[PDB]
Amino acid sequence: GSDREVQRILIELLTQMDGFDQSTNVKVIMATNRADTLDPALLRPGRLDRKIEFPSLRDRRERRLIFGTIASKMSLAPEADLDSLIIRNDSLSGAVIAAIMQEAGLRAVRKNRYVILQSDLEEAYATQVKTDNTVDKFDFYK
Amino acid sequence: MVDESDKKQQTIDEQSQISPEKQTPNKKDKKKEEEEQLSEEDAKLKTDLELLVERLKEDDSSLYEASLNALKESIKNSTSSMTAVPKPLKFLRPTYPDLCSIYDKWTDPNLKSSLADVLSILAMTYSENGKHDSLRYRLLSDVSDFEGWGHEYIRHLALEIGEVYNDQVEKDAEDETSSDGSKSDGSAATSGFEFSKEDTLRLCLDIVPYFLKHNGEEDAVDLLLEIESIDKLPQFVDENTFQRVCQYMVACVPLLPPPEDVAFLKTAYSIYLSQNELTDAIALAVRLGEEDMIRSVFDATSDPVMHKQLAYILAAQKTSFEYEGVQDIIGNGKLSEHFLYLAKELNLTGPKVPEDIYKSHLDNSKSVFSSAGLDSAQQNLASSFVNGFLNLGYCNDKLIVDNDNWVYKTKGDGMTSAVASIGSIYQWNLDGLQQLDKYLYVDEPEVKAGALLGIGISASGVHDGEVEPALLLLQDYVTNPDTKISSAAILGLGIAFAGSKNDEVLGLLLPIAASTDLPIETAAMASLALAHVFVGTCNGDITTSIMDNFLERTAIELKTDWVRFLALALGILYMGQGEQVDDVLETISAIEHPMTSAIEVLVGSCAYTGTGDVLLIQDLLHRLTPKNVKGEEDAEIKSEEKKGKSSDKDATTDGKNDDEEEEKEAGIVDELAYAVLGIALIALGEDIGKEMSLRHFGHLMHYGNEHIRRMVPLAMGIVSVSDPQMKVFDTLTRFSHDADLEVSMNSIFAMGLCGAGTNNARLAQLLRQLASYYSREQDALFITRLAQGLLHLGKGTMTMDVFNDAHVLNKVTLASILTTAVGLVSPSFMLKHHQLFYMLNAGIRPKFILALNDEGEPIKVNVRVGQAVETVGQAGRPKKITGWITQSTPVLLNHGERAELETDEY
Amino acid sequence: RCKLKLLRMERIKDHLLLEEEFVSNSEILKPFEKKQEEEKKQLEEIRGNPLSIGTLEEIIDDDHAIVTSPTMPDYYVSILSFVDKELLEPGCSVLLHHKTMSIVGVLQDDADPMVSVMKMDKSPTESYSDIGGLESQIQEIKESVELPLTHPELYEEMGIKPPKGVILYGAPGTGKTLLAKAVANQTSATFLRIVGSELIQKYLGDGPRLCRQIFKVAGENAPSIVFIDEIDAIGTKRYDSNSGGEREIQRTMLELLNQLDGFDDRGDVKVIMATNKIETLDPALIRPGRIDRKILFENPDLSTKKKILGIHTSKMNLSEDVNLETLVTTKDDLSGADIQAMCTEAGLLALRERRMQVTAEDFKQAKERVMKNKVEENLEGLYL
Amino acid sequence: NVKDLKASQRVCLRSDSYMLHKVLENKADPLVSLMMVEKVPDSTYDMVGGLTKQIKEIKEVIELPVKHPELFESLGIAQPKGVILYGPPGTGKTLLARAVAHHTDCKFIRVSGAELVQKYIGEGSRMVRELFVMAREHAPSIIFMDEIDSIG
Ligand SMILES: Nc1ncnc2c1ncn2[C@@H]1O[C@H](COP(=O)(O)OP(=O)(O)OP(=O)(O)O)[C@@H](O)[C@H]1O
Ligand SMILES: Nc1ncnc2c1ncn2[C@@H]1O[C@H](COP(=O)(O)OP(=O)(O)O)[C@@H](O)[C@H]1O
Ligand SMILES: [Mg+2]
Ligand SMILES: [Mg+2]
């Protein structure tokens, strides 16, 4: 009995989505953690046409910007650099870049300093580093 | 497709797909130009034809329709159909299919109607040449089969078809009927029919059966006789011919009322007689029932040879098959005339040798005795009857009979029925008569009377050939002025002889059975015996029976029971006939008492059988009437009325039963449902009518030889514990008797359940007790078909006493009748000059696949079985011969027939 | 052809049955008889207005029962008890009274859509000898399947228990499938047919309940023949491996042993199994007395194929051109489903033409397409 | 009365005894439930054109015994059972099955391995017969059992 409750809600979604069409609204935005919860009919165009991927891999110019936006908000020291973060790992998520900088803002208070030093900033990288053997400075496949 | 001028043959095929320039302009312009150009058109006729042949392979309608569209006009526009008649008449050959492309290969109701007429006229005129017959022939036997002619060619044949049918219905008749505007007579279309018949006969069968019946004349069938009898061997095999002939008769039965039907069967007999199989001749001659033809097939084997050869053994067998024994008496006396050995031949024609093989079968079977016995009451009367009911057919129980104690401990009529059941122990046997003489010459006349019933049952095995006839013994007891003795005497005489006709027996029952002036209720037995003797032949419907019915009404009308028994006898006397039964129907109705109306409705069943599709509704309008009249008024008598109600119900089921045997072999399927709903009508109508109908249900199944014997009687049984009158249970077991301990293992228990379980009086209890033992015999001793077997289409003669007892309320007196169980089927065993009492092998087939014949015929696959098997009933009925492989050739074929086998070894 | 008259005759029997039936229902079904009127009156006087479907969990022998309704609340119900105290059993659907819930009555029967798959409405238009050929290894399937239903009388002369069970095995396409469907047309007893890929499920626990069921229904109607088509499918078909796998397959087999023979003493369930993986079955399955005569089928021989090919070309258009004997020459111990695919593909050549004649050319051409199938998943050419 | 009433037809009840009042002006159909929830259109052959050879091959074996099974009965041919469409995905394998269903006048029942279409059985090992049976009710039909043969 419990599964037939789940499904009865999902049917109404599909049906209300059919009615929703040819309207000036934007048809629903939805996200999913994984791609193995979809049903064949839910993914089908006319209900869901667009499939906007998000890659973790991103390229050299984009890791720069994402470090760079999280440095716009906070204070740094002139000793700190954002260019020593390209050479290390080359597959990060946007949350972990918001994570390291927040973790470095706790180590800063253990020194008792309000400006992020490059000592703080490399230690925070070293924790929750999620190392790879596909990225630069870890290779012999060259 | 598209035009590609005439530069190679491939493109001429495409040229005429769009628009011929060889047939449209050229011919049309030519014909409406000079009238000396007919010499050019004759050559250009040949050119036209080739294009039809090439495009008589192309499926699409459009490129045959449109290409020849303006030719369809030319028939009347340029050629005019007739001008210099031979040349325009002979130029209809290519244009005739043009007419068909709009008639058939397109539907425009306006053009289809109008061109039906035109096709028929131009076909009639153009078959005078016989080049229209040749035109049909190339589509009958196609060039390269395609869709087009598979629909068009039926239309050619249908023009002649419709016409011949229309000549009976109308009062305008052939060329004055304008639905075809063609004549069926002349030497212009009558020669077209015959010419067509030869062609369609050679490879197929199309209009050939169909011509015969539409004329309605046996002359038509004889025109075909000539052609086929040449074709019997060389143009196609004998077997294929035999299938043709029987397919004509069996198929057209509901289209052949009695007077038509017999007239058609004569010619069929002649075609067989022309052909080699004299085995086919005898079967069909018995169907006709004419003594002359029986003698003719017998003569065909006898006269050529001056020695005993296979021919005389085979003649004796052919007459042996009928257990009616009308054949037996006839052939015994031909043999004395011819003069060879008497001792083997007359016996073999008679039912004597059938006694002998029953013993060979009994030895294998065994004997079982399981009877109860308790002294003093209806429970004692039941028990002593039961022992014979378990010993039906020839069984060995000498010792049990020898104890005369229990015989005497039954009382009154019980004694009569006690000795009667002793007779069935040696049913169809030369023994018994020794133990019976004891009772006949000693104590109370009641045991002497019961002895005569037992003599009849035992004498079934030998009465033809004039050795130990029952008449010789039984005459004295009829003379005797005691009613119990005389009534019992003549009942045994009818069983003993059978449907056999003998002067001394038949003429004995003529003085009495017109002596119904005497008020006697046990003088019914006079007509019941007479009916069984008489049937077997195409009845004259002798006048002694007709008259004695009238006389009985005059003397008594306060004894409705006696006239009810007697009424049934009249209808069964007439059965075996339908022509003469129309005659007596009108006669009975001249005199009208409500008591007389009882006789009419029973006799209607026999009158219309052969169609009985008018009969069934007749016995339903009759049901409406009592109630119908009562409403109409608004906006001593007792016996006559009680008779009226009872007869009507009996007749309705009676009608169903005759019909399903004579016509169908598979509509037996449908016939059950009428009875369930029919009994349901009554259940929720008259309670008086219900009493008769319950019993009738059991015998509906038995008469038709329904296919499911497991489910149906049992399903009914639970209902029939609640309903009054437990004789229903006896009639259910008549059906279930089929092969013993196949159906009957369920039966004993089921009938034993309601008997032991319920008590509702000791009168009812007796009938329930008897029913269980009747059903079972040890190791399937025998089977009963009500059918003759030789023809499953035939109706029985000895089995009619089973049929008889459902219209009457149960009594001990009826219980006496039931000890008889004849209707038997022989176990088929192969024969030789030294007499082999076992079979060798047989094939049996449950499911045929053929629907071009009602039962089909067993193909050469069957399940094989060994020696020593009784004839297998429904669910096993198609039986093929396995003897070919041992370098033996069957002389006597098998289908599921009762007939014994005979084989010839090289 | 020429069967028009008999079909009209059958039709004529049908007209008469439809007629008298209809009028009998209409107005002369007279409910002006007191044994109709008075029985329904006082039957409806205790019988509802709303009839409150319940589900009987169990009975008590004091004229009471505990029902659980699908709506919710249980009730300790009485019983009017003109309905025969002992005729109702757990699993019944009972009629409760719209006032004080008493068992007004009892519904005789109810059914599932999962036994719809099992049971059948069909009446095959093929009867035997459209299995024409292989006509002595078919005496082992109509002497132990057909015959004891038809005659128990023969097995009474010898006495002891009658036959039970067959396993059909051999090459695919040699008729196993049609053999089972051909004895069912003859016998006319409840023919259940269940595929083995539905006995394998992606859910556990319901596997055994399905398998237990088949024979419980089958015994319940007194005669039944259960065709399990493809018991070779229980080791080669499987979904996921965390609700399928070894475990699922082992249980279902275990269930079948109890059902097939076990200790149930259920009704007549003559069993027919088709298989060509007979060594993925238990030794208590292929044990004797559940298989009594087992039938082996191998490929026909040259003269057997002549029997097969003449069955198949009788339905088709023929000519004098057609020669069956040389189609036989080419094939060498192949299945009768191969022969049957040549005749089916021969009319596909006639369809392609849109010419309704079938000729020797059409049979030879489809012969080559049939042999193209055998040796072109092969890539040796000549045996390496 | 009960002859005006039938399975799967919605009625009106007067709910103090639930005494039937009228038939309803509605009727549910279960086959549409599955087809809709999957949601596939039908097509013509002008939405598939370009593999016009393929349209001929499929017209021969599918459409002609719907419009005329008469020809096959004379021929004595057991009509085509399973018909494989196969190739690279998206080549219009699917749209050709749609195009035929409009011309054959069949209900285009796209099956895809889904059980969301079901909420009343929920597995295909107990819905093979019932699937066939609904296409029998609503006949004719074209049962597009799409087996990708990579699932799982
Ligand atoms: N020996 C035979 N006699 C007559 N017909 C046959 C014979 N063998 C095969 N056929 C025909 O070939 C057919 C196809 O057979 P069917 O599909 O029943 O074969 P199968 O052996 O059951 O196949 P599978 O191996 O896939 O289980 C049958 O329907 C039947 O008419
Ligand atoms: N022949 C065609 N004509 C028009 N559109 C086509 C054709 N073939 C494919 N398409 C298009 O490709 C898509 C894929 O079609 P579909 O039939 O669903 O593919 P698949 O073969 O993967 O099942 C649709 O958007 C459709 O319009
Ligand atoms: Mg199979
Ligand atoms: Mg697709």
Crossing angle for the helix pair B637-662 and B687-704, nearest 10 degrees?
Answer: 20
Residues with Cβ within 8 Å of residue B640, at least 6 apart in sequence: B557, B560, B593, B594, B595
Does D126 sit within 8 Å of C358, measured CB to CB? no
- Is the C-beta atom of C177 inside 6 A of ligand 1? yes
Cα B163 vs. chain centroid, distance in angstroms? 32
How far apart are the CA of C318 and the nearest CA of chain D, in angstroms?
Answer: 10
CA-CA-CA-CA dihedral for D61, D66, D67, D69, to nearest 10: 80
Site of tokens 């993925």: C280
User: Whole-angstrom Cα distance, residue B776 to residue B387?
Assistant: 12
CA C308–ligand 1 middle distance (angstroms): 10
Cβ neighbours around D28 below 10 Å, total: 10
Is D119 within 8 Å of A4 when comparing Cβ atoms?
yes
| Strand C74-79, strand C93-96: pairing | unpaired
**Residue B416, C-beta contacts closer than 8 angstroms, at least 6 positions apart:** B446, B447, B449, B450, B453, B484, B488, B816
Instruction: Please tell me if residue B722 touches chain C, with a CB cutoff of 8 Å.
Output: no
- Which atom in ligand 1 lies closest to the alpha carbon of residue C134? 1
% helix, strand, coil for chain B, step of 5: 60, 0, 35
d(CA B876, CA D98) in angstroms, rounded, equals 52
In whole angstroms, what is the distance from residue B425 CA to residue D150 CA? Answer: 79
Residue B356, classed as helix, strand or coil, is: helix
CB atoms within 10 A of CB B22: 16
D133 vs D136: CA distance, rounded Å: 5
Report the residue of chain A nearest D33, measured CA to CA: A11
Chain D stretch 65-104, residues whose beta carbon is closer than 8 A to a beta carbon of chain A:
none
Instruction: Give C241's DSSP letter.
Output: T
Distances (CA, A) of B421 to B604, B637, C55, C369, D149: 35, 39, 57, 74, 78
Residue for token pair 């060259």: A142
Chain C residues with CB-CB distance to D under 8 A?
Answer: 49-50, 98, 113-114, 116-117, 195, 197-198, 200-203, 239-240, 314-317, 344, 347-348, 350-352, 356, 358
Sign of CA dihedral A108, A113, A115, A118: negative
Q: Residue B438 is inside which H or E element, if any?
A: helix B433-440
User: Per the structure block, which two tokens stand in for B644?
Assistant: 């009226």
Q: How far apart are CA C324 and CA C322, in angstroms?
A: 6
SS (HEC) of D80-130: CCCCCCCCCCCCCHHHHHHHHHHHHCCEEEEECCCCCCCCCCCCCCCCCHH
Which stretches of B332-430 are DSSP H helices?
Answer: 334-338, 343-349, 352-365, 378-389, 398-402, 405-409, 413-423
Count of alpha carbons within 13 angstroms of residue C108, beta-carbon side: 0
DSSP B773-809: HHH--TTS---B-SS-SS-TTS--SSTHHHHHTTSS-
Asked if B852 is an interface residue toward chain C (Cβ–Cβ < 8 A), one would say yes
Nearest ligand 1 atom, CA C181: 18
- Residue B538 identity (one-letter amino acid): C
| Surface-to-core class of residue C380, CB atoms within 10 Å of its CB (0-12 exposed, 13-18 middle, 19+ buried) | exposed
Distances (CA, A) of B905 to B37, B832, B833, B892, C254: 74, 9, 11, 13, 59
Q: What is the phi/psi pair of residue B664, to 5°? A: -75, 165
d(CA B822, CA B34): 87
Half-sphere exposure at residue B647, Cβ-oriented, CA atoms within 13 angstroms: 28
Q: Is A4 part of the contact surface with chain D (CB cutoff 8 Å)?
A: yes
Closest C-alpha to B425, from B332, B379, B358, B342: B358
CB contact under 8 A, C113 and D126: yes
Strands C74-79 and B903-905: unpaired
Resolution in A: 6.3
Q: Are B336 and B342 in contact (CB under 8 A)?
A: yes
The CA distance from B259 to D65, in Å, is 48
Angle CA B243–B249–B254, to nearest 5: 140
| Cβ–Cβ under 8 Å, residues B167 and B185 | no
CB-nearest to D116 from A7, A18, A46 is A7
In angstroms, rounded to a whole number, what is the distance separating the alpha carbons of residues B140 and B157?
10
Helix (H) or strand (E) holding B654: helix B637-662
The verdict on a CB contact (< 8 Å) between A10 and D116 is yes
Q: Identify from B615, B741, B749 which residue to disrupt to test chain C contact, counting C C-beta atoms within 10 A and taking the largest count.
A: B741
3-state helix, strand, coil in chain A (%, to 5): 45, 0, 55
**Is there a contact between B832 and B890 (Cβ–Cβ < 8 Å)?**
no
Residues of chain B contacting residue C127, judged by C-beta atoms under 8 Å apart: 847, 849
β-strand partners of C227? C193, C272
Mutate to test the interface with C, among B847, B852, B859 (most CBs of C within 10 A): B847
Q: What are phi and psi of C296, to 5 degrees?
A: -100, 135
Q: Which ligand is nearest to the CA of D98?
A: 2
C-chain CB neighbours of B253 within 8 Å are 9
Q: What string of DSSP letters covers B701-740? A: HHHHT-S--SSHHHHHHHHHHHSS-THHHHHHHHHHTSST
User: How many residue pairs from chains C and D have C-beta atoms closer than 8 A?
Assistant: 57
**D41: nearest Cα among D95, D83, D79, D77:** D95
Q: Each residue of C327-351: b (16+ CB within 10 Å) or e?
A: bbeebeebbbbbbbbbbbbbbbbbb
Both structure tokens of A61: 């110019």
Report the C-alpha gap between C378 and D35 in whole angstroms: 41
Ligand 1 centroid–CA C256 distance in Å is 27
Helix (H) or strand (E) holding C272: strand C268-275
CA dist B539 and B533 (Å) reads 11
Chains B and A touch (3+ CB pairs under 8 A): no
User: Can you say whether residue B283 is alpha, beta or left, with left for phi > 0 and alpha for psi between -120 and 50 degrees?
Assistant: alpha
Q: At what angle do helices B687-704 and B727-736 cross, to 10 degrees?
A: 10
Contact D126, C203 (CB under 8 A): no
Q: Which amino acid is at D95?
A: L
Residue B377: phi and psi, rounded to 5, are 170, -170
Of the candidates B88, B115, B94, B96, the residue with the CA atom closest to the CA atom of residue B51: B94
Give the torsion through C-alpha atoms of B754, B760, B764, B766, to 10 deg.
70
Q: Are D66 and D136 in contact (CB under 8 A)?
A: no
- Residue among D37, D119, D122 minimizing CB distance to A41: D37
CB B370 within 8 A of CB B382: no
C-alpha–C-alpha distance, residues C32 and B734, integer Å: 35
Which string of DSSP letters, residue by residue, matches B123-158?
Answer: HHHHTTTTHHHHHHHHHHT-SS--HHHHHHHHHHHH
Task: Please report, to the nearest 10 degrees, the dihedral formed by the alpha carbons of residues B241, B244, B247, B248 taken in order.
Answer: -120
Contact B52, B67 (CB under 8 A): no
Q: How many CB atoms lie within 10 A of CB B388?
A: 29
Ligand at shortest distance from the CA of A49: 2
Q: Which of D39, D51, D95 to mutate to test ligand 2, by most ligand atoms within 8 A of the CB atom?
A: D95
CB contact at 8 A, B571 and B602: yes
Q: Which chains touch B (3 or more CB pairs under 8 A)?
A: C
How many angstroms separate the CA atoms of A64 and C151, rounded? 92
Q: What is the DSSP letter of D61?
A: I
Cβ neighbors of B392 (< 8 A, separation 6 or more) are: B424, B427, B774, B777, B781, B782, B821
Amino acid at A50: R
Query: Tokens 């409840």 belong to which residue?
Result: C190
Nearest C-alpha neighbor of A71 from the set A60, A59, A89, A84: A84
How far does residue D85's CA lie from ligand 4's centre (Å)?
Answer: 10
Task: Give the Cβ contact number of residue D22 at 10 Å.
Answer: 10
Q: How far is CA A83 from CA A60, A94, A118, in A?
A: 11, 17, 11
In a 3-state reduction of DSSP, which class is residue B278? helix
**Residue in C10, C24, C186 closest to B667 by CB:** C10
Rg, chain D, Cα only? 20
The three-class DSSP label of residue D141 is strand
The phi and psi torsions of D111 (rounded to 5 degrees) equal -105, 145
- Comparing alpha-carbon positions, the chain B residue that sits nearest to C159 is B779
Integer Cα distance of A106 and A120 in angstroms:
9
Q: Is C341 in the pocket of ligand 1 (CB under 6 A)?
A: no
Quote the tokens at residue B678: 């029919």
CA B273, CA B386: separation in Å to the nearest integer?
49
3-state secondary structure of D25: strand
| Cβ within 8 Å of residue D120, ≥6 positions away | D30
8 A C-beta contact, residue C186 and residue C128: yes
How far apart CA C102 and CA C96 sit, in angstroms, is: 5
With CB atoms and an 8 Å threshold, state whether A40 touches D38.
yes
Specify the amino acid at residue B656: K
Distance in Å, alpha carbon of D66 to nearest chain A alpha carbon? 30
- Number of residues that this document lists for chain A: 142
Q: Which of B408, B1, D78 is nearest to C342 (CA)?
A: D78
What would the two tokens of residue C144 be? 């132990």
How far apart CA A30 and CA A42 sit, in angstroms, is 11
The nearest CA of chain B is from the CA of C156 a distance in Å of 8
B696: its two tokens? 């009738």
